[model samples]
Structure formats: C-alpha cells, structure tokens
Target: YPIFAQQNYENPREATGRIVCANCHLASKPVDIEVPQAVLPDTVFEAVVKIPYDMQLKQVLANGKKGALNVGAVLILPEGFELAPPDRISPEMKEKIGNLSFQNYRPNKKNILVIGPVPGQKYSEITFPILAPDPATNKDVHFLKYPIYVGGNRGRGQIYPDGSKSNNTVYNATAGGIISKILRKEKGGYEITIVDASNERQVIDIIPRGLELLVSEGESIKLDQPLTSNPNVGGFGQGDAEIVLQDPLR
Candidate 1:
C-alpha cells in the first residue's frame, strides 16, 4: 500500500526510482533477477522475478519456524524502457501475479510499473513485459540498471549456508558498480554510494541491520546479487544528488 501510503506516487516518502519492495518487505539476502538480454531499442521482451521461497523455507525449517511463502514485488523500470500494460503481461501471470500499471514520474518524464502479488496465492515467480525506447527518440543511447524489490511480511529464523544460525538479510545492486562510499546513522541508515559505468552517482540507503557487510570501499557488486548474509531484518530506501556529471559554479 506504499504506493498510496505516502506522498504522491511521483515523489513519495522515498525518492522516486529508489523505492523497491524493500521499502516494506525483508529477505534473507539479495536474490538474483532476470531481465531481457540483448534488448534492442524499441523492442519488447518477457521478464521474470523469481523468489527462492522453498530455499528460505528450508532455512526456517532448520530453525523451527512456520513456513510461509507469500511474496510481492515492484519494478522501477527506467525511462529507457516503456512500461507494459496489463494486456502485454502473460495471461498466466495475470491469473497468478496481478496486473501491472504504469505511473509517470516528473522531471525525468520516466514511467514506472508497479506489480504486486495476488493475496492467498503463492508462486515461485512473477512475470511481466517491457519495451525499449528508441535511442533516436530519447536523444541518448541510454543503457542503465536499477533495482527490482521483492518483499514479504512474515517472521522466520534462518540458518546460513555455513551451518550457522543467523538473522540477516543479504543485499546487492541491480548492476555492478564501484562502492564510492557507505554512510552510517542517517535518516535512511547505512547509506551506500555507487558510481555506475556512465559515471552517474547513485545512493542506496535504509539498508537494515543484522545483515553482515560483505563489501568495503572500492569493492564491486553485481546485478540482483547478494552482498551479505546472516538474516534477520531488512530496510531499503534511496535518494539522489542534485549535481550533474559535469558542472561549474552553480
């Protein structure tokens, strides 16, 4: 309900394009995501967001907790891709994972699609479609990466792969990037600084506690990847800078 729980969808409690499922849900660690590969401008493709429910259940089983696999997710599709409507979404998906809707974000004139899981329905995966924007029409050959948040509401005890009891949620980025910095104790909590290939600076914050930190300054990360593990709490939020790639006295 965060879509309407806060301010306007365009500029909510968390900065636009930064709000992911993490805004409310928690996971043991970052789960890998799959998007269209070799996508050409103005093309359409199918994508899936899969969650390892059974895997998490196994961990809970070891710790003696009830198993529940209700999952939900949201996609922050950048301006480079056009958001697909309900019709484009797979029929089976429409029957399983609810329909997707597009919303506009001011300033960037970007479009984002919000997809949530249907209640009382549990699935290992979710599916949706998207379109690539023509480079000629956008003025830039933009190829950027962003996050796909997977969320759930429940409590579970987990045992890490190393046979150790833990309470942490691992995390990673939508794409590989250098760790420019990691901020601590701000409104967002454990904020991270990343510099992408295009030299754009991004900030990922509200990373919760109990999860181990696996990277350090100058370390690199991967898309829909896992960075730490222990498994207990998770908090994800974001904000951006006002400066541009290049600038002078402003």
Candidate 2:
C-alpha cells in the first residue's frame, strides 16, 4: 500500500469492476469462511477471512519480522455492503483508513496489519473491517475473500514521489494468476476464462489452446505480452486438461 502524494496506486474499487482479490493472489480458495450465519442487512461488523495461506507469512526474515513488504488485505464485500468506520475495529489497530485504493481496483477498504504473525502461522487471517450490506435482493448467503496482492515498493513506500524509482511501479516485477478453468472447448475455437474472488467468472472466446499459443495448460503468463497479445493467454495453473484426455492429471 504505497501512499504517494496522498494518492493510491492503481487501486480498483466497486466503482470500477467487481473487487476480485484472486486476480493476483492465489489465496481466494477458501477452506472455511466465517461470517454470521444469519447476518442482518447494512450492519457494521467484522468478517473473519480464514484461508490456508495467510499472506503475512510469505518471504520471512530470520528474526520473524516481515521484510518491509506491502503487507495488507483487499476484501470484496457483497453488493450494497456498508463498511463500518475505522473506530469500530476492535483491539485498537494502529493505523487504518477507509475507501483506499489497491493495484487493479480499490479494495472495499484498507486496514493495516500492524505486525506480522508468529513464524509459520497456519490459516493466517486479516479481519476485514466493514459494514454488512443490507441483505441482497437475490437472497443467497454468499462469501467473500482476502484478495491480497503485494510487491516491492522495493523500498519505495514514500521515497518515490512519482512512483517506485526502480521502474516507477507498484507491483514488483513479480505477478501471478490461475488457469481460471475452461469455459468451452468446442471446435468453434476453444475458450478461456478468468474468474474473480467472488466466484464470478469471465471468458475470452475465439482463442487457440496452449501448444499453439506457446502456453501450457498451467503456465505463468505475463501481463505485458500474452495479456496484451491477441494470440496468447492464461493463469499459471494446471487443469485435468485436454479435449481427448479430459479429467486425467490435474
């Protein structure tokens, strides 16, 4: 979370598109999500995001402190969800600001982690501070995710006014995504899909499969080339793939 001249990075918010956390961080896969079984509408409360991989645990130092990484979380709230002001955050978090921005989209809001967890903390969690949306008209009990994405400010948190001096960027050169799953593979040109944190999926049809596009079913793709290229695509993820040999190796 780089604070440059009182502005955020390319933070995507509800105003842009659906807040998709897993667009980068692979932690969207929830093993168990804890929310009120019968949550009331427009209520101000905290949602506990529990997942197998807690981001604060990644790339640690010997003394168990994080190495100045951009550590935080971006939670996608259900539509019409209202966020509680920073004051309600229990236990008195050090610093927090609402309606902040993230790389691709503005998060529901931003909260400071303050401190990293003990070494190898399992099911790492960051309590997303927010107000519950009034019950949706759809009336389905839905879930959210901690779509956390970070990279080196490369020590450019504040030092770089225009942006990271190294290359003027927020996301360190390191980036990520998943295969997203197949949409359709009919003879009418195989299709590709990109799903978001809320379990919402989107597709890019009329494309060739891996071997032809220089991508394997689960190979990592860069946003510069393949992402912008008309011929290449995908998240570096594997599938139980193949047209003739479907449902085989994952």
Candidate 3:
C-alpha cells in the first residue's frame, strides 16, 4: 500500500517518499517570528584597540607586506540589549572621519573588521587593528629611536666611548605603546570577544544565521546558526590584541 514500503525506511539513505510531516506542518511557515520592538536610548561610547601579549608589530613588519594588522577591542553596550550594524563604522561615522582618517584609524580591515552587539550575527566582527601611530616617533614610539644628536651645529664633535670603533653593538627599539586614538564615547564600546586564525574560521561559519535575523528583526531575537553553514567569520584575530611593553631583560 505504501510507496517503497519494501525499502528500508528506517535507514535514511533508502527513504524515497516525498510526502512527509514537514511538507504540510512546517514547510511554508516563515523562518522568522515577530516580537515587540524595544526603543533604545541614544548613547555613545569608546572602544580601545590594542596588541595582545602573544604577538607584536615587529613580527608583522618583518613579513615585509603592507596590509591590515589583526587586533582586538572591548565593546561596552547598553544593558540587557544587543545591537548589530552592517558595516563596522556607521555611514554617519564614516562621513565624519573620511576615508583617509578611517583608514588611518584601523589596521588590517580584512582581519580586523567591525564589532557586533551579540554573537552569531553576520558582520558582527568586533576586532580592529593595533594601528601604527602617525609620525611613529612622536606618538607611540615602539621601534626605531630618535636620532641622537648633540647641539644644532653640523661640526659639533661627537662623543665616543673608549672602545674599538669596529666593535658594533646593535640596540633594538622598544616594542609596544599606544597605537591608535582612544575609541570615543559616542561610538559605543564594541563587543568584546576572543578570536584567532583558527576560531575565526569557525566564526565565519557560525555568525550569519544570527546576523540574518538581526537584519530582518532587529536585535531582539536570539538564534543559533551552525558554523557549517557559513565559514568565514572571525572576531578577535590571532596575535596580541592588547598593548604591552616588552620586557627589556628578555
């Protein structure tokens, strides 16, 4: 009586029937549900981007490539509420900062993107770059020192320690210092989450489901999307996300 009744139905590989409970009961239902929308008070905050303890700028610089450097930030949002935005920097904010300033604002845009209020949201990445300070010598001088000069005259005699002129001692510049401007209050603190090359790949797969819902339903809904579906999301990237001065001894 039943089509393919002779087939091993219990074994999923053998099932051939098209009609099932899902077809009528759930097939046409909208994946999203409706809920009350909450109004959030207008607020702004600052997020700090720093190099973590595990990695340093010199390592990246040694690679001899120019691109974004991965870094992290701590986001502080409104209590009991979550938020999501398509681009990391809002259009309004972008307009204010301009492209040059914006680019100067963060390092590694590909790796260090925007921050999301909640987890599992697409484009919810909350990492930024440990941007190299402008005029590297004046602001946060990490490596390379100010040329040591005595007096403003060209003929001023130089002082030399009593040693063989052939003996050379190399002094490497210190590592680590404030890299970028402090995140402002109006911008709101970015969501803080730990991430790296490996876990970042995992996030790529997991965040879209939550992000899709947020885009469609605002920040009130909670959903979990498996990483298997998507595979490129990453938050705090691998390496030092916070700033730390290197120990002179080691």
Candidate 4:
C-alpha cells in the first residue's frame, strides 16, 4: 500500500496551503514550514481583577507554596445565544482554551458557562472562574490579568522559516474586539475567595483584608495584607474570601 494518498488541489495557489502540513507531518520535504494560522485561535480577550493573599504565609514561605487558589469570574453570553455543547466543542476550540495555560477546571465544572444573549442579538456577558496557585497574593489580580492578553500560542509569537515572526494576528480578530465591547457595555465585575494557611474559610468579607470591587477601567484597587489571622494567635484578622457577580445577561 502507498504510504499516503496524493493530495490533489483544485487550484495551484491552494496547493501552498497544504505544503506546511505535508512537509512536517509527511517528512517528504526537508523544510521547516511555519503554520501560524493553523496554530492560532480566532478570539482574544482579557479580564482584570484584584485579590488579596495571606501575608503570614508569604512572610514565612517567602518563596510561596503551591495549592488551590480559588478564583471565580463570570461572563454574560449575548442575548439569545447558545454556545456549542461541551461535547460538541471543536478540537480547535478546546485546544485554544488549553493554550490559555491557566489552571482551568475540567469542562464540566468550569464556571465559564454559556447562556442566552438576552434575545436581542445585542450583547451577552460570560464569566470565567478559576482556582490556581499564587506566587504572590499581596499583588493585585489585575496585575496578573494585565499580562494575560489572549492571542498567539499563549500570548506570544511563533518563529517562521524565514526568521520572521507572527504575533497577535488572530484569525477572528473581530470576535475578541466584539467581546471586549460587550464586556465594556456590561461592566466587568469580580469577586475573590480568600482562605487561610490552614485552608479554613474565614470571614466572607473581612474589613481591610476583604477587597471586593467591580472591575472598572483604570482602577488601582489594592488588597489588604494578612487576609486572615487567628484571633487566638495575635489579633482576629479577616477570614476566607470568595467573589460573586450578578449575571448581567440574566
């Protein structure tokens, strides 16, 4: 049997499209072809928020420890909108989300659920809730979000054979822009969940330590240090933290 079937293209120009895959996957040609479009996603967006960390742990560990850091975010889908079923999500879409490199929960437990857009085709909001380890809790979540622009192969460029690079050139650039516009109209909101070093839930909203706010533009909201402290130890500090947002789409 022939190792592979010949790829007959309807047009000569179309033949170029298959060259990269053939060269790499088939090993027929000794060439390193670049396929930026093939590897990149169509939509890109970012969410900004601020969160507080446990100061005693930070001071003690100094280097920090790794554990579940519960974070929740919400997104309002456009009115009358329906997302592709989790099982129906294209492999490419799944790959795109994986490339985000965040500690996303399994598909079934993800907070980023898809809902109706509100019946006008106008706009809808969606939320993304995630729990991941924090190297530095005292830092604001916005500081993390600021660096989390979505695009490219995890927000960076890829090198091509000719030594040139392609970056932030998404296939569906408008999708991200449109989503950002909708989020702006909807007004992004945020809530952070705080836990003590002992992994106990403290006060839902601790004074100074509890810093929950809506994600407004150009805001420099800060997180209070020592998010939770044991009253028996020295002073009764704050308690565990969790974020909540009212679904604008609802």
lDDT of each: 0.46, 0.32, 0.20, 0.21
* Alpha-carbon runs more than 4 Å astray in model 3: 1-40, 44-56, 60-68, 74-78, 84-90, 95-250
Task: Give one digit per residue, the lDDT tens place, for model 3 in 96-124.
Answer: 32222112112311212222122121111
lDDT of 4 by residue, 76-176 (tens): 22221122334644565555433222321224323222222121111111122223322233232221211111110000112233444222111111111
Candidate 2: misplaced stretches above 4 Å?
A: 1-32, 53-72, 87-123, 133-250
Candidate 1 lDDT by residue in tens digits, 1-250 = 3343123344432544344334434344434356643465566555565544333442222222433433444444544655655666667656654443434333364544444334313444555566666655677544443333323222332333234434334465645677788776542236667667655657563355434566777887765556565444322222221101111121
Q: Pick the candidate with the highest lDDT.
A: 1
List TM-score per model, in order. Answer: 0.41, 0.30, 0.17, 0.18
* Local error of candidate 3 at residue 67 (angstroms): 9.6
lDDT of 2 by residue, 1-250 (tens): 3233114335433344432222232222333334443444445554554333333332322232334223333444444443465565555531332223222123433332111222213214444455554324435533332232211111112123433322111211122334454444543224444433343433342343222333334544443334322211111111010111111121
Candidate 1 least-lDDT 10 residues:
241-250
TM-score of 1: 0.41
If the candidates were sorted by their TM-score against the true structure, best first, what order would they fall in? 1, 2, 4, 3
lDDT for residue 201 in candidate 3, whole number 0-100? 22
